């Protein structure tokens with residue numbers, strides 16, 4: 001079974017990936033969209 | 036006859052597995068990648084504006100492949116997770 | 121001169137509510153507490169107590185940070201100053217917000233001394 | 240239960256014991272003070288209540304687990320070829336304990352492909368491996384052959400009371416599940432009723448590869464349904 | 472759980488949305504539309520009711536996010552729009568601080584869940600379990616139609 | 630905008646996959662360390678009524 005430290009690292013990596021892709025999307029939409 | 040079945044048991048060869056359980060996670064991930072790298076093209080095709088017959092054809096032809104690949108990844112992943120077959 | 125009154129009536133009940141005004145109201149706590157040396161203390165060790173001055177300080181810091189954010193939003197809508205100095209002012213405001221948040225966490229450490237996440 | 244599986248090439252055992260102590264009941268009722276004061280002295284020689292059981296598993300076992308009706312018991316310990324089990328409470332005279340214990344073994348030790356053909360298999364399942372000296376008042380031995388197996392021969396070294404063949408569905412069994420073969424024995428001893436049930440079946444490759452296809456069918460149907468639902 | 476609560480327990484389970492929350496309310500007040508009135512009323516009601524009673528903090532958790540995102544998203548647009556190094560440097564300095572806050576947000580909302588809330592309520596980790604042992608004794612060794620009398624905050628487990 | 634919509638859609642699906650994985654994975658901290666059980670006195674009754682709904686019919690429940 002997966003350990004506890006491995007699960008902690010997995011959760012942190014999922015959160016970092018999510019918070020980075022969200023910012024990438026927002027920074028693409030702010031420029032590419034007609035303002 | 037118990038004696039003859041017990042005689043046939045030991046004489047015969049052992050069981051050689053098809054794909055060893057130690058290298059199944061590799062195939063699991065390498066099939067999970069492909070089964071979504073292909074099934075996105077299906078949604079792009081159906082979304083795209085074109086002839087209905089051509090859309091149907093270029094949807095099913097690369098949907099059957101994604102079907103097979105997903106139906107063969109969902110066995111390797113299930114074995115790798117600890118719930119066999 | 122009507123939306124400003126609803127704004128005041130909204131924030132004046134939003135800000136003291138998240139700062140536990142009811143907690144100091146439900147349990148009578150003195151606004152100012154004196155130490156053994158008769159020195160006014162501003163924060164109480166632990167997480168299950170609070171002094172009436174802490175409400176004011178916390179709400180003031182919340183106001184400062186929210187106001188800095190709103191000011192960051194409002195900076196590009198002025199033309200009395202040049203573009204470059206406008207960018208410089210925005211950067212200065214961001215830096216002030218950074219250091220104020222650091223100071224706020226430094227103050228929160230008093231209420232929870234075993235907090236790993238720090239600047 | 241004994242779950243055969245050719246894709247993963249593992250045979251996993253799961254057993255559900257209902258255990259009763261038959262020794263003399265204790266008068267004055269239980270009292271933890273006396274128990275915890277007598278074990279601190281050297282008096283745990285051959286006491287008549289059960290504190291630790293010693294399951295004797297096959298040669299190489301992995302993924303041991305010991306489970307109870309109300310959850311997982313954490314007082315278990317798996318050394319080499321031995322699985323020590325500590326119940327929740329010591330089983331005095333007249334007390335019942337129902338538990339479950341499971342493990343996994345390599346399949347290469349129990350199957351053998353035949354000589355004439357490469358699709359006829361012979362399996363030799365052990366009939367009992369539990370505590371050292373118990374007595375079983377009912378035994379229900381279930382062997383779960385894979386989805387498309389078909390039995391040709393069944394032999395047992397101890398006369399059984401009842402044999403039957405059914406089907407039972409399990410994970411990713413989308414048609415007819417697994418083939419369950421169940422024997423019912425009545426009186427068995429722990430270490431002197433040592434035998435091996437010999438099953439002889441066949442498993443053609445035309446049904447070995449039907450397991451991925453039976454999931455591909457559902458996924459393809461779901462996709463062809465989403466297509467119609469989105470184009471209409 | 473039927474009590475009021477001090478200010479630390481608001482920063483505890485909302486890392487930095489708690490001081491973008493007034494900013495979001497004010498920025499909704501700036502340009503009122505039909506739905507902004509709903510969001511503001513929801514925000515003020517849940518804020519007061521969570522300040523009074525702590526069991527109702529969960530209901531306040533949605534509006535802490537929705538109000539904060541509106542406050543934060545606007546900032547990003549202004550500072551993420553690229554339409555001049557002297558300005559790109561300011562844009563980067565203003566957006567990097569908030570990305571850093573978002574990362575501290577993740578590193579906080581993972582630590583809090585790991586430490587506080589993920590505690591089993593039937594097995595004390597000091598690993599002792601004397602509730603399941605006695606309950607299993609009652610389940611195994613007592614007849615099916617027997618009545619057990621205990622205080623009212625264990626009956627469900629029994 | 631011809632190539633923009635498709636990029637935004639793919640990114641809006643990757644982001645939601647990551648969101649689901651970060652919401653599901655951040656809660657399994659008491660299930661990895663300790664066996665999957667029912668915490669909190671109250672949920673026990675809900676569990677017993679779900680067992681009674683899945684063993685008997687809907688009318689009996």
Ligand SMILES: *[C@@H]1O[C@H](CO)[C@@H](O[C@@H]2O[C@H](CO)[C@@H](O)[C@H](O)[C@H]2NC(C)=O)[C@H](O)[C@H]1NC(C)=O
Nearest residue numbers: 256257258259308335336337338610611612615
């Ligand atoms: C645990 O195991 C015991 C032992 O078999 C079970 O007790 C039997 O229960 C049935 C129905 O209640 C009775 O008809 C039998 O007479 C009982 N046997 C003995 C030896 O007393 C019990 O049902 C099992 N399960 C639980 C939850 O206790």
Ligand SMILES: *[C@@H]1O[C@H](CO)[C@@H](O)[C@H](O)[C@H]1NC(C)=O
Nearest residue numbers: 400401402403404405421423
């Ligand atoms: C043997 O098992 C079968 C399968 O359920 C059953 O129908 C039959 O009645 C049993 N016979 C005896 C004597 O137990």
